[PDB]
Amino acid sequence: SLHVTADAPGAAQGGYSVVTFRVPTESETAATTAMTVTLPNVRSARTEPMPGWTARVDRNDKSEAVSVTWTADPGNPGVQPGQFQRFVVSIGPLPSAETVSFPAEQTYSDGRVVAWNQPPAANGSEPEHPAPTLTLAT
Amino acid sequence: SLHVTADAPGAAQGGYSVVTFRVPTESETAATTAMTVTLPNVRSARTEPMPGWTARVDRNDKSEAVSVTWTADPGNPGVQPGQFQRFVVSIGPLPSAETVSFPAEQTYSDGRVVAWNQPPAANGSEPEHPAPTLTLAT
């Protein structure tokens, strides 16, 4: 996909899922060096060990996870032009909603940051940087 | 300043300077958790040790530093609402130009990223997020 995708086959309303964000490096020269994803204020959020990357999960006053950021360690050149990388976070409970989005911000080695924060295609509109979105089973 | 500022009293064309970026947290609730600054493709770029933060300096094929990123370690809550933080990088040689800018991207704990990439005030225009800029002595 030329887009960041979100995958979580289980995914149910009020459920816990391992969510995988697959991110493309859309530059011919610069590499992806960090990814920040906005989380739907979940009670639980745990990343899995990713050699060469450090993850932080930020929390609000209620101890909900509000976002997660993965950052390439020094010496790690990050995700190269043309390649994809998976970033995995286990979260829950997912909202009691039909749909949930995960606005994301992708940092490149050349200093640029790409926002993946547009709402879904409708009418027409065909956004080139939509927020990754999941449908949640009842 | 309600803006990111750049300070480097020495700063000369073809010179080496310690450049200090002072960054305000402009949220009432979210904290600054990373800063990425675009560098003018310098041969040399070294950060100074910042407890609780990790820095990476990205390079291109010619071994020039193209950007620098500081990221708050896990457990470090980042720069709190209303506070400022200095991020310091020693770089050179600075371009043979009267002016150099350092476009920056500021990440907040709530997942938002603020771009400091607008060109300087002129006519009209009075940008609220200008790229930090230095004047370089001849």
From TrEMBL, chains A, B:
Residues 3-136 form the YncI copper-binding domain. The keyword ATP-binding does not apply. Keywords: Membrane, Signal, Transmembrane, Transmembrane helix. The keyword Membrane applies. This is YncI copper-binding domain-containing protein. It comes from Nocardia farcinica (strain IFM 10152). The chain holds residues 29 to 164 of 219 of the full protein.
